[PDB]
Design a protein around this ligand. Structure first.
Ligand code: SF4
Ligand code: SF4
Ligand code: FES
Ligand code: FES
Ligand SMILES: [Fe+2]
Ligand SMILES: [Fe+2]
Ligand SMILES: [Fe+3]
Ligand SMILES: [Fe+3]
Ligand SMILES: [Fe+3]
Ligand SMILES: [Fe+3]
Ligand SMILES: [Fe+3]
Ligand SMILES: [Fe+3]
Ligand SMILES: [Fe+3]
Ligand SMILES: [Fe+3]
Ligand SMILES: [S]
Ligand SMILES: [S]
Ligand SMILES: [S]
Ligand SMILES: [S]
Lengths: 633, 633
């Protein structure tokens, strides 16, 4: 089972699934092999009813699609549609929070409110919205209107791009026509241009993709901004992760998906019903996180994270998971059928994301507390039904220090230099105690033994004094393996990095270092890493393609991850991907994405499936940036 | 060659291509066989980097996608993305015309103007925009603003749906949640909900698809509305079709694509340069149409149609095609490589639709006349270069009477009943002289011998007294086979239909009947058939699912055609498709689309590849509607 997952709690659950005859994601993968090589390489098109068209990677015919579409065009069109689908997810999440904020301040949903007034005014100021002499609710109405306006064409481009990157970066992107005109506008234009008999030039297509990836970045940033206004900006928190956070004697409720609009409320209401839970024979309600909505409540409230991504079914296999409360994205629909075998109640809540066989509760922000109580009562009923059933919760968990929003990082650094908080970080980049910065992002993928690439790459980077930050299921992988426990700094970190983490930790009244890896939050919170990097760029007076900063989607899966990697390249970062995107069927497309894009944006993809080799490539990219700044390396 | 195309001019060009070694669409199809059965049946997913996933239609594993996605979910997600891509094309076309109108009336593009003032005021009145005491340019500004506002969420739903269908139909659709909130909003929501780990209930997914198809309908209707304001509403015209409209002694210039914003201008400027062309040794500039932009200039100006869809390369094979001027959609990218062999200059004009190897001219509405002259001068240069080269233009053409906008049809009927123009049509439906109405729409598809289904079905329907209307490449097929020549009424039409066509024709001072089939225009002009059918519904006080009206996408290809067929079903029509959409891998999805949707919208798909059988099925659907109205059949 260590060939399927490097997580020992997952391995124990895979044994239980096997002996109980419950099919898992790994079993469904094995049944899919050998997978189609045309699709793996990108050399398949279904964009019209003349298809499917395929192109042999090598050999004889077919060499071209029926309409004349070349391998270059077919690969670039497929990739662009993946970018657009990722942008649609992140920006659908942001749009939902924009509507929630509007309703809150219009008096339509009093379970929601402005919790971070300071963040609200800073966002308004960034967008140019006047705050002097205005009520908070009017400022917020204007912020929510601005958010919604970025989805369509107007007299300004997308402000959640142009106001969040350095002017010099905006200017480079504008010169190549890459600034998005509106988020949903770009998604639709990608769908148009990639339909049959439209765009058929690989460079043109891929420039469209870069622009659409910036619409994804805007959605991410808008989502983080709005969630912080509504739910609070994260600050350092301590909690736990892995399946041992489940408790046999409690009602275990997992929040799963991405958008915390419902699950932030579940967290609050769950505490009101501790007595209702005690009356049903439980110790209380134990809310735990899966995937990114789990990250959201971990970062803001310290809710422990049960599991992530590819291993999500395993939480059910314990027999102790009484409810799994779903919104959207990254939820394996297998959970609805597994729940018949495990005695979990799987509940959907969003109109556009239902799963046959799950119970649907039509969550409305206007009724949020009511809906939360209905859902929690279903989970209490389910707890009662398992009275006397044995469960098998692996007694495996890690300690997690998290909550490192960019504001939190700046505040922690300010204890070393109050009026120039980024300077201590920069000083230690220059002196070599911090070699550079690597962001780990994205999913697990069944093709890769779970967490193997994240942990292998991270270990090598940390020994080489790289400051490692993480989000999403990259953060999940690292937290489940101990990389968010400061007790592991001595074992994992190079001496320079250890010195820096220790100095910041001690200056923040911890008597110990910051953790080895800094958890910056959910997938939309990749935007927080952008904020940090853009602030460093501003403080140094350079663009992001000169900073020693890289990204790694070391085990990517979702279309969202393809969008994030593409905008990481578009904003100027060397960006590793550790699973093969469907591009290898076209050498010209591969060469654009891994080489000639450097001449447009300064970033580039590093496609490398071997994690030891990927780490060496990422260190080489960091060290080239250091050399370009005249620094030793 | 009659196995590839039933058009004899096409067959002659296929022989020339063969002897010259020029590969065609049919050759590229043959090289693709056997095509992938997983993609043909819809049982393939590439929505994440764990894929590709496939499901065997029958037999053993794989039976389910890696994430747990069932055959039902995979098929419904693929179909929804096709609908969204079609909506993106039609609505991208409409959005471009909205921006053009705005620029015209703001004084930024004086090659464009309000040509149909009456249509402008009727549209404004339909949308609720005040006209009394307003300047035309201000009314039009408000119309263009309304058009752009329908792309995003606002306080009203999409007005180019809710204002164009009967209230009773709007009410049915609203009750099922199917009215779109914004065109690009729906496209993006489809992309979101169909991404990995989101919507996974076939009924829910397909309801989303129906709603997105109504966003496509809105784009179509908005496109026709704006094009009529800018370029004039069609009225009856006589011209010719097929490759014999090319002239060896003239500069032959094809306009090809969909959006007439540029090609309406090409038509005007071409007449100014007749002397510049004569000086280069040509008789003049012979503008001819391909595909839908050809339909647009055919309907408004009588420009002859050269060819359509699958046979577009054949116009180049003659050796006489000096330029092919491209905008977007349905252009085989093979044209850019064929042009090296044929001596045609292929010119792209739109930033989002380029083809490697073609010459790009960056058309701007503000510079339209200038750009047109640059493009026509390239075509004149190309004519000169073929001085003395033999060409082979098949001496094959048909006469075409066209220009039957809904306004034109109402006006023609008004000659039989001035104050109740729809009543003569209804009287003849009731008395059986007109059995019902069939709209032919969509593309040719290389899988079907070109035009065979359109002409086989149309012949059977016309003998059974069905009023046949057509758009797009369905109109192209029918025009190239003589179905728009009134001289063919005696041979093709039943006695009842002949009597009606003759009475309307004679009352319109023609001394002869209307043509056998009424050409209602381009693909967006399917919206004109909706206007006609909705007006008939309003006049009868019933909804569209009670009228004896059907649709047939008899040879469909493009994602756009899938969107149109889906909205035809959603507005209440029995809708035939004569090529297999990728649905047969899921019986539950097939049953929804061909049967249980009747209970939601009253329409339904009829999937039938055999055209004789399809005609019988369409007649049965018409006759069931007649019976539901208490009429003989
Ligand atoms: S768009 Fe071209 S390559 Fe794709 S399926 Fe259609 S014919 Fe084949
Ligand atoms: S979304 Fe599911 S079915 Fe599709 S490729 Fe990914 S794992 Fe396979
Ligand atoms: S041929 Fe397998 S993905 Fe299309
Ligand atoms: S397996 Fe052929 S279309 Fe995917
Ligand atoms: Fe996520
Ligand atoms: Fe068309
Ligand atoms: Fe995910
Ligand atoms: Fe993610
Ligand atoms: Fe992910
Ligand atoms: Fe994830
Ligand atoms: Fe077409
Ligand atoms: Fe069409
Ligand atoms: Fe078509
Ligand atoms: Fe067409
Ligand atoms: S996730
Ligand atoms: S993620
Ligand atoms: S077309
Ligand atoms: S068409």
């Amino acid at each position: 089972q260590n060939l399927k997952s490097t997580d020992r709690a997952v391995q124990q659950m895979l044994d239980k699934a096997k002996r109980e005859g419950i099919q898992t994601v790994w079993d469904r993968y094995e049944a899919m092999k050998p997978q189609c090589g045309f699709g793996e390489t990108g050399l398949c098109c279904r964009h019209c009813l003349q298809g499917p068209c395929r192109i042999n990677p090598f050999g004889d015919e077919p060499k071209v699609g029926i309409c004349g579409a070349t391998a270059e065009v077919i690969v670039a069109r497929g990739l662009d549609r993946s970018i657009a689908a990722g942008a649609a997810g992140h920006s659908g999440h942001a749009k939902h929070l924009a509507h929630t904020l509007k309703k809150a301040v219009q008096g339509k949903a009093a379970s929601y409110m402005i919790k971070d007034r300071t963040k609200l005014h800073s966002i308004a100021k960034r967008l140019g919205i006047p705050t002097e002499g205005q009520k908070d609710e009017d400022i917020a109405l204007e912020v929510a209107k601005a958010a919604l306006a970025d989805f369509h064409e107007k007299d300004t481009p997308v402000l959640w791009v142009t106001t969040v990157l350095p002017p010099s970066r905006v200017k480079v992107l504008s010169a190549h026509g890459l600034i998005p005109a509106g988020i949903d506008h770009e998604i639709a234009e990608i769908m148009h241009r990639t339909s049959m008999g439209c765009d058929a030039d690989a460079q043109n297509l891929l420039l469209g993709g870069l622009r659409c990836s910036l619409a994804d970045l805007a959605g991410c940033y808008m989502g983080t901004d709005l969630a912080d206004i509504l739910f609070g900006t994260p600050a350092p928190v301590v909690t736990e992760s892995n399946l041992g956070v489940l408790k046999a004697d409690a009602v275990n409720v997992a929040v799963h998906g991405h958008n915390p609009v419902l699950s932030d409320i579940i967290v609050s209401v769950s505490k009101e019903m501790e007595n209702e839970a005690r009356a049903a024979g439980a110790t209380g309600i134990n809310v735990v996180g899966i995937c990114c909505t789990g990250n959201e409540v971990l970062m803001r409230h310290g809710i422990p994270a049960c599991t992530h991504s590819v291993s999500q079914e395993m939480a059910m296999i314990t027999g102790a998971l009484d409810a799994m409360i779903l919104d959207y994205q990254c939820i394996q629909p297998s959970v609805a059928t597994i729940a018949e075998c495990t005695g979990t109640t799987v509940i959907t809540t969003m109109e556009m994301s239902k799963i046959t066989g799950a119970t649907h509760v039509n969550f409305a922000e206007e009724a949020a507390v009511e809906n939360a109580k209905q859902i929690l009562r279903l989970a209490i009923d389910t707890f009662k039904r398992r009275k006397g059933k044995p469960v098998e919760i692996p007694n495996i968990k890690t300690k997690v220090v998290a909550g490192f929003s960019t504001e939190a990082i700046i505040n922690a650094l300010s204890k070393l230099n109050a009026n120039d908080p980024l300077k201590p970080l920069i000083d230690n980049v220059v002196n070599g105690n911090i070699r550079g910065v690597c962001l780990f992002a994205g999913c697990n993928n069944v093709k890769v033994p779970q967490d193997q690439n994240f942990t292998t790459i991270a270990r090598k980077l940390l020994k080489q004094n790289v400051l490692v930050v993480a989000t999403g299921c990259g953060a999940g992988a690292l937290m489940r393996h101990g990389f968010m426990d400061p007790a592991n700094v001595d074992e994992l970190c190079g001496d320079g990095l250890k010195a820096v983490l220790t100095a910041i930790g001690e200056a923040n009244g911890l008597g110990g270092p910051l953790p080895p890896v800094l958890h910056m939050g959910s997938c939309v919170d990749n935007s927080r890493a952008v904020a940090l990097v853009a602030a460093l760029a501003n403080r140094l007076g350079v663009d992001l393609d000169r900073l020693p900063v890289v990204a790694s989607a070391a085990e990517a899966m979702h279309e969202k991850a393809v969008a994030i990697g593409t905008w990481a390249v578009t904003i100027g970062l060397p960006t590793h991907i550790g699973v093969l995107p469907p591009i290898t069927g076209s050498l010209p497309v591969t060469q654009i994405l891994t080489s000639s894009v450097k001449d447009i944006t300064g970033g580039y993809f590093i496609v490398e499936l071997d994690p030891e080799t990927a780490a060496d490539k990422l260190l080489a990219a960091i060290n080239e940036r250091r050399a370009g700044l005249g620094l030793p390396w």
